[PDB]
Design a protein around this ligand. Structure first.
Ligand code: VW4
Ligand code: ZN
Ligand code: ZN
Ligand code: ZN
Ligand code: ZN
Lengths: 69, 73
């Protein structure tokens, strides 16, 4: 029904929001510290000096284990 | 249809996986360091000396800003 289409759209947008903002292919599993932006996969995060969201210096990258993984 | 019910169930399980594993009421927004388990809201994370998944000692809690986050706004 049209309701099935609405739910498919919500599921798709939620799943897309869990993907890396840089490569768009891998799941987000890394946090820039200390700002806390958790927007990249480990490969894209490893190469950044500053947070791509807030420009704060990245002191280190913390790997995150999320239940949604 | 039956597929509407299947999709509602998938959506519910995905939304539940984003809720704190301790209180079940607030969104996950905190990481236990150094283990990395990201399973609690900031209120439950502040009260745990050991990670509830792996029992590693919590040295500190890192707040996480996730693109999936939602609010009353
Ligand atoms: C305990 C889980 C959360 S999870 N999968 O550990 O992150 C849960 C929370 C709220 C309702 C149902 C189930
Ligand atoms: Zn990436
Ligand atoms: Zn940042
Ligand atoms: Zn909680
Ligand atoms: Zn842990």
């Amino acid at each position: 029904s049209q309701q099935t289409r609405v739910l498919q759209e919500k599921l798709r947008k939620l799943k897309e929001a869990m993907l890396c903002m840089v490569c768009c292919e891998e799941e987000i599993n890394s946090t820039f510290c200390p700002c806390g932006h958790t927007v990249c996969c480990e490969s894209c995060a490893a190469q950044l000096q500053s947070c791509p969201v807030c420009r704060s210096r990245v002191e280190h990258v913390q790997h995150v284990y999320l239940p949604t993984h």
